[PDB]
């Protein structure tokens, strides 16, 4: 069980750790988060009490190094940093733990929610979507735009999601216009799965990462990416059975975790209606269709 | 975006554009079967592709053979239209290719957009205009070439005959839309108005009769009256 110590909490802030969140008061003696489960990516996220705009945060994996948070009063944010000195770090954490200045990652033993949202998400894939190769952790915020959004402006601070565009030469083989537009199987299976992602695991990992960025930061481009990757599968007549069964599980946990009050901004009516009721896969997402119909019947 | 009354003069500027109307591509007669079920029999159709500036009409005849053993024909008809328009653009020299294609029905936008991905600089646009191009099959010589076709064929016409020698494109288009509107509202009466006087004939190389400027004014008035008469009937007003 790993720890992300905080130097201090000089500004009042709502701190997120994965799907959990805690309010910290200005200069409250908060020195971080302990008992973080090894084996998963995590995201530690922030919303300042005095400017609820710019949700921002850090994707990390405690297996890859010792990470801490320190407030930067110049840039005005909580920054993740790596401590390269193992013994200094162990000694910092031991002190804060002994003084019980740390919140415990509050996992219920029955609860597979975080595993189920991050099953295919791997830090190495995150670091290719979020390019800052001098750090082992990845910064995301509300306002970062996607490579796709930038085509339709600072490339350094972009989310390099795989560009999906149903009306592009990539998606449509010359002489198979109607066939490829009405049945995206070619695009999904040859271009995206065999060509770019290499396997369904990498494709699901990007889908899951896009959802989490949409949910935790209200990142609009992330939300567009999550919907596009769902719609590409649902609009394909030919999808491996294992992918459909896994997609149904993935979406079920995403819809289950979504705050009820954010459905109106995070769910695209057109995509969900098409996917559950008109698409080739309209009958292949039983779990997802049941939770959507019971939790968000308004949208449908 | 969309072509309306606000940007009407744009039709007659010097940027090459084509209207595409797909309403006569897939044509059927509905009939009873021996067992008393209903069945369709396709008849020859046509894509109506018109340069509103020049009057140049690219009439692609759709032979019933293109439907043999195909499913969802009303959907296929949109994609076949888009394929044939894309093939027509690729057949034109670069300096003759349109800068815009306006589709008369919004259901043509995606099919044409996807067929024209190779031409990202050609704008595909809808129109708010209600254009009566469905009535093209009421022009006897266009109807005749479609019905007699035994194979796919492209036939080139000037839908304005020699009018542009005497009038502007704007006026020629307004005359054409009024003629087609009349033919669409009351075909019998419109054709009666156009042929009632046997001294005015249709030249072998023309679609419409050889009316003097004064006779066009009279014809145009009779067409307006026909549209108003018919409108007063439809609505009891």
From Swiss-Prot, chain A:
Major localisation:
cytoplasm
- What is the protein named? A1 cistron-splicing factor AAR2
Database matches in CDD domains: Aar2_C (cd13778), Aar2_N (cd13777)
After translation, how is this protein modified?
A: Phosphorylated on serine and tyrosine residues.
What is said about its interaction partners and assembly? Answer: Heterodimer. Interacts with PRP8 (via RNase H homology domain and MPN domain), competing with BRR2 for the same binding site. Component of a U5 snRNP complex that contains at least the U5 snRNA, PRP8, SNU114, AAR2, SMB1, SMD1, SMD2, SMD3, SME1, SMX2 and SMX3, but is not a component of the U4/U6-U5 tri-snRNP complex.
Query: Where, subcellularly, is it found?
Result: Cytoplasm; Nucleus
What are the record's GO terms for cellular component?
cytoplasm; U5 snRNP
**Modified residue Phosphoserine is at which positions?**
236
Which GO biological process annotations does it have? spliceosomal snRNP assembly; spliceosomal tri-snRNP complex assembly
Q: Which residues cross the membrane?
A: none
Please, what other remarks does the record include? Present with 7330 molecules/cell in log phase SD medium.
Task: Provide the alphabetized UniProt keywords.
Answer: Cytoplasm, mRNA processing, mRNA splicing, Nucleus, Phosphoprotein
Point out residues bearing the modification Phosphothreonine: 257
Q: Which gene encodes it?
A: AAR2
Q: What does this protein do?
A: Component of the U5 snRNP complex that is required for spliceosome assembly and for pre-mRNA splicing. Involved in splicing pre-mRNA of the A1 cistron and other genes that are important for cell growth.
- Entry annotated with the keyword Cytoplasm: yes
Query: Which region ranges are annotated with the description Leucine-zipper?
Result: 244-265
Q: Which family does it belong to?
A: Belongs to the AAR2 family.
- Give the matching InterPro entries: AAR2 (IPR007946), AAR2_C (IPR033648), AAR2_C_sf (IPR038514), Aar2_N (IPR033647), AAR2_N_sf (IPR038516)
Curated annotation (Swiss-Prot), chain B:
Q: Which cysteines are joined by disulfide bonds?
A: none
What segment(s) does the record annotate as region RNase H homology domain?
Answer: 7-237
Q: What is the effect of changing residue 21 to N?
A: Reduced growth at 30 degrees Celsius. Strongly reduced growth at 16 degrees Celsius
More about this protein: Present with 468 molecules/cell in log phase SD medium.
Summarize subunit and interaction data from the UniProt record for this chain: Component of the U4/U6-U5 tri-snRNP complex composed of the U4, U6 and U5 snRNAs and at least PRP3, PRP4, PRP6, PRP8, PRP18, PRP31, PRP38, SNU13, SNU23, SNU66, SNU114, SPP381, SMB1, SMD1, SMD2, SMD3, SMX2, SMX3, LSM2, LSM3, LSM4, LSM5, LSM6, LSM7, LSM8, BRR2 and DIB1.
What this chain does, per the entry, is described as: Functions as a scaffold that mediates the ordered assembly of spliceosomal proteins and snRNAs. Required for association of BRR2 with the spliceosomal U5 snRNP, and the subsequent assembly of the U4/U6-U5 tri-snRNP complex. Functions as a scaffold that positions spliceosomal U2, U5 and U6 snRNAs at splice sites on pre-mRNA substrates, so that splicing can occur. Interacts with both the 5' and the 3' splice site, as well as the branch region. Has a role in branch site-3' splice site selection. Associates with the branch site-3' splice 3'-exon region. Also has a role in cell cycle.
Q: What is this protein identified as?
A: Pre-mRNA-splicing factor 8
Q: Which organism is it from?
A: Saccharomyces cerevisiae (strain ATCC 204508 / S288c)
């Amino acid at each position: 069980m790993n720890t992300v110590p905080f130097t201090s909490a000089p500004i009042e802030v709502t701190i997120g750790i994965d799907q959990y969140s805690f309010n910290v008061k200005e200069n409250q003696p908060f020195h971080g988060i302990k008992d973080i489960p090894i084996g998963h990516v995590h995201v530690i996220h922030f919303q300042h009490a005095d400017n609820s705009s710019m949700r921002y945060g850090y994707w990390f994996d405690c297996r890859m190094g010792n990470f801490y948070i320190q407030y930067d009063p110049k840039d005005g944010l909580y920054k993740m940093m790596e401590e390269r000195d193992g013994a200094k770090f162990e000694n910092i954490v031991h002190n804060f733990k002994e003084r019980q200045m740390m919140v415990s990652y509050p996992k219920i033993d029955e609860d597979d929610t975080w595993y189920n949202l991050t099953e295919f998400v791997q830090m190495d894939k995150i670091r290719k979507i979020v390019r800052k190769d001098e750090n082992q952790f990845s910064y995301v915020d509300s306002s970062m735009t996607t490579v796709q959004e930038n085509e339709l402006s600072d490339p350094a601070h972009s989310l390099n999601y795989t560009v999906i565009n149903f009306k592009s030469r990539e998606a449509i083989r010359p002489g198979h216009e109607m066939e490829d537009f009405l049945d995206k199987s070619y695009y999904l299976n040859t271009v995206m799965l065999q060509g770019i992602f290499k396997n369904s695991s990498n494709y699901f990992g990007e889908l899951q990462f896009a959802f989490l960025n949409a949910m935790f930061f209200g990142n609009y481009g992330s939300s567009l990416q999550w919907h596009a990757m769902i719609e590409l599968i649902c609009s394909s007549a030919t999808v491996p059975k294992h992918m459909l069964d896994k997609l149904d599980e993935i979406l079920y946990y995403q819809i289950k975790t979504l705050p009820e009050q954010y459905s109106d901004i995070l769910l695209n009516e057109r995509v969900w209606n098409i996917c559950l009721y008109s698409s080739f896969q309209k009958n292949s997402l039983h779990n997802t269709e049941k939770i959507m119909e019971n939790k968000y019947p308004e949208l449908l | 975006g969309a072509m309306n009354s606000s940007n009407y003069a744009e039709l007659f500027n010097n940027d090459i554009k084509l209207f595409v109307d797909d309403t006569n591509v897939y044509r059927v007669t509905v009939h009873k079967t021996f067992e008393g079920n209903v069945a369709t029999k396709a008849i020859n159709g046509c894509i109506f592709t018109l340069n509103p500036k020049t009057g140049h009409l690219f009439l692609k005849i759709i032979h019933t053979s293109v439907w043999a053993g195909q499913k969802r024909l009303s959907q296929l008809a949109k994609w076949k239209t888009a394929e044939e328009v894309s093939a027509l653009v690729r057949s034109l020299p670069k300096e003759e290719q349109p800068k815009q294609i306006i589709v008369t029905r919004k259901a043509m936008l995606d099919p044409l957009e996807v067929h024209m991905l190779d031409f990202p600089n050609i704008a595909i646009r809808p129109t708010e205009l209600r254009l009566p191009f469905s009535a093209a099959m009421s022009i006897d010589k266009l109807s005749d070439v479609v019905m007699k076709a035994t194979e796919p064929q492209m036939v080139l016409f000037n839908i304005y005959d020699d009018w542009l020698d005497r009038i502007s494109s704007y006026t020629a288009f307004s005359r054409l839309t009024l003629l087609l509107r009349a033919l669409k509202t009351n075909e019998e009466s419109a054709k009666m108005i156009l042929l009632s006087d046997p001294t005015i004939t249709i030249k072998s190389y023309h679609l419409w009769p050889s009316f003097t400027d004064e006779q066009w004014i009279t014809i145009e008035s009779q067409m307006r009256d026909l549209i108003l008469t018919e409108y007063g009937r439809k609505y009891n007003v």
